[PDB]
């Protein structure tokens with residue numbers, strides 16, 4: 001089981017196998033549709049709050065040109081925010097949003113510094129140094145991106161935020177911006193702790209549900225289908241077979257003389273071979289809508305879909321030969337040097353239930369097992 | 379079913395478990411969060427040390443020596459507080475004490491963040507690191523192992539102090555800057571609350587899943603009592619323990635008689651229905667200490683007994699046989715009575731004797747009870 005082995009060996013440093021990671025990314029994108037809706041809404045609200053704050057804070061009568069330039073930049077992203085808005089709600093193109101989400105964030109960061117880079121252009125001192133911080137925290141919003149995607153994005157944002165102040169506004173406020181950029185560095189580090197626990201929990205919650213579902217779908221010792229799933233699926237198979245008007249053939253597999261194997265070879269060794277029986281039974285089960293299941297204990301049942309009586313006899317004979325050709329020693333057998341297998345085949349028609357076919361299948365094995373080696377009766 | 383499975387099916391939006399589950403979860407949270415306190419103490423010591431360096435970096439000691447001294451006293455005070463709480467957090471013996479002051483420790487850190495600022499306006503010097511108050515809020519969201527609502531209510535209280543101190547002790551010269559920064563900090567809390575919710579929700583589902591996955595796989599059964607493989611581990615351990623203290627172990631196998639009639643006349647859902655009442659009445663009849671009851675597979679089950687004599691084993695076998703006989707279930711196809719009949723086989727084990735020998739004797743008596751018209755118990 002690919003899911004089980006990933007959980008056992010651990011997934012530290014937050015990385016799956018190539019196929020599992022691709023499945024996880026689809027899982028991440030599927031469950032982050034609601035988060036994208038909130039992220040677009042909050043970004044529109046935040047930038048709207050920036051505009052009203054700027055107008056009510058800076059005087060226009062003395063610096064009208066500065067106000068006009070700032071107002072153009074802010075509305076520019078707001079209009080650009082309404083053009084990426086149709087690309088985040090339509091499910092038809094949600095895939096492209098996985099690659100443009102970094103584009104839609106770093107561009108927002110670009111405008112955050114653009115508003116400040118104009119206060120010193122017009123010779124007006126700043127009134128809030130917390131603008132740069134809110135652009136950085138937008139990176140950590142849960143847009144369904146991975147751990148390393150968000151982390152590498154904020155670090156790039158941090159570098160660009162530091163760069164804009166070094167080449168601009170020189171010999172003025174340099175100490176206060178460098179400290180604020182340094183303070184932001186701690187902001188990124190603190191948020192990295194929390195995001196790590198989020199992504200680690202998310203992956204191992206995804207791994208659990210896949211493993212839990214598979215475990216209930218199959219049995220444990222072998223890879224066949226457990227009892228309660230087999231009953232439900234066979235009823236669906238019978239209903240489907242009646243819908244398309246074609247008979248369903250049932251063949252049951254039973255091991256003969258298992259006390260001798262148990263008491264002479266040991267309890268763990270006696271059925272250690274059960275997996276070997278499972279694989280050689282499964283390799284003979286490759287047809288479409290052809291199932292392999294264990295009914296609990298020594299006896300197994302496999303269901304054939306759209307097969308004729310000649311085919312059922314042919315496939316039953318070769319699997320009996322195949323298990324005989326395995327040649328596992330079993331000294332207590334009265335029908336051969338090695339362990340022997342009994343088969344019982346029954347045919348089911350449309351509108352005829354599971355109970356009747358099982359009744360029509362059991363005594364063929366009973367008449368075969370007794371006074372018989374590996375005989376098969378229809 | 380399981381309490382863990384019950385919660386998962388019910389759902390846990392708003393992040394609240396049952397009282398017993400939440401107490402287990404909180405202990406689970408504290409156990410796994412022990413490593414996080416190592417980093418939390420490290421960063422808080424490092425951050426406050428860096429605050430001291432920054433304050434001395436530019437503050438004019440010549441012009442304002444009193445301001446520098448007062449700030450230096452406050453910052454070293456919490457570092458002293460960090461060195462007195464540090465021995466109370468790394469010791470596993472009082473880990474409950476270590477997180478008994480976690481809201482207390484964070485609030486004090488927030489207090490010094492504002493106290494090392496308001497003194498700038500006390501001495502008439504404009505501040506230079508308005509971002510300082512924000513760092514006192516982000517400390518609340520550090521993964522200290524607290525619950526979701528504990529962190530959320532803590533940061534909101536820290537938000538209140540920022541607004542209160544700047545409106546009252548913040549004078550009137552830099553107010554318009556203060557409310558803007560406090561309003562921006564409100565967005566900081568809101569943004570971090572989104573990520574916090576996903577963290578706690580993802581964590582809680584795992585604990586329900588891990589408890590459910592482990593218990594269903596290793597232990598228990600879908601309808602029965604215990605998995606066959608786990609029964610084998612217990613039986614080997616019980617035999618090893620029994621041989622160590624030199625006492626016999628009694629084994630009893632319970633079998634259903636004439637099950638073909640029940641299956642083909644009453645149906646499969648009736649057949650598995652007969653199983654689960656059979657399981658519960660066998661479970662209620664198994665109350666001895668270190669008593670193992672399991673579903674081996676198919677129709678037969680085995681119960682393991684520790685420190686019992688032949689008379690007790692025969693006595694308990696008879697009453698459960700009468701109990702299941704007293705249970706009125708229509709099994710009209712029976713050839714041994716009006717209702718379904720149950721066969722039992724009891725075997726005794728000695729010291730240093732393998733499970734195959736006792737199992738062979740146990741089933742041997744079972745068939746010799748079967749051919750005797752059922753309803754028989756043999757040793």
Ligand SMILES: Nc1nc2c(ncn2[C@@H]2O[C@H](COP(=O)(O)CP(=O)(O)OP(=O)(O)O)[C@@H](O)[C@H]2O)c(=O)[nH]1
Pocket residue numbers: 012197200410413414581
């Ligand atoms: N059982 C749990 N283990 C957890 C939980 N959170 C973290 N961990 C542990 O985190 C481990 C991840 O590997 P590391 O120790 O390298 C992770 P790091 O040291 O960077 O941070 P922690 O996750 O705080 O240990 C993993 O072995 C888990 O046992 C949790 O909620 N439950």
Ligand SMILES: Nc1nc2c(ncn2[C@@H]2O[C@H](COP(=O)(O)CP(=O)(O)OP(=O)(O)O)[C@@H](O)[C@H]2O)c(=O)[nH]1
Pocket residue numbers: 221254255256257258259262267270271296297298369606675
């Ligand atoms: N290790 C395991 N042993 C099993 C399992 N299921 C059944 N058994 C063992 O197999 C036996 C039950 O099957 P039967 O007694 O009907 C075996 P036998 O081949 O003699 O039956 P017929 O061929 O129908 O006469 C019994 O010894 C069980 O302990 C299993 O999943 N694992």
Ligand SMILES: Nc1nc2c(ncn2[C@@H]2O[C@H](COP(=O)(O)CP(=O)(O)OP(=O)(O)O)[C@@H](O)[C@H]2O)c(=O)[nH]1
Pocket residue numbers: 031034035202391392576579580
């Ligand atoms: N299968 C997953 N569901 C998730 C994940 N993250 C969030 N959710 C969903 O979160 C939901 C729990 O919250 P509610 O249903 O009350 C809606 P709320 O807005 O509070 O949460 P979200 O649905 O996460 O926005 C739940 O239905 C999940 O489907 C995830 O990683 N996997």
Ligand SMILES: Nc1nc2c(ncn2[C@@H]2O[C@H](COP(=O)(O)CP(=O)(O)OP(=O)(O)O)[C@@H](O)[C@H]2O)c(=O)[nH]1
Pocket residue numbers: 227295296633634635636637638639641646649650675676677
């Ligand atoms: N509904 C279920 N039927 C089961 C289950 N396990 C076995 N069986 C049925 O039990 C039958 C196997 O034969 P049994 O060992 O029950 C023999 P029975 O008690 O009918 O006759 P005696 O040998 O005279 O005691 C067969 O019809 C199986 O389908 C199970 O978990 N559920």
Ligand SMILES: [Mg+2]
Pocket residue numbers: 254255256257258298
């Ligand atoms: Mg058999």
Ligand SMILES: [Mg+2]
Pocket residue numbers: 633634635636637677
């Ligand atoms: Mg029987």
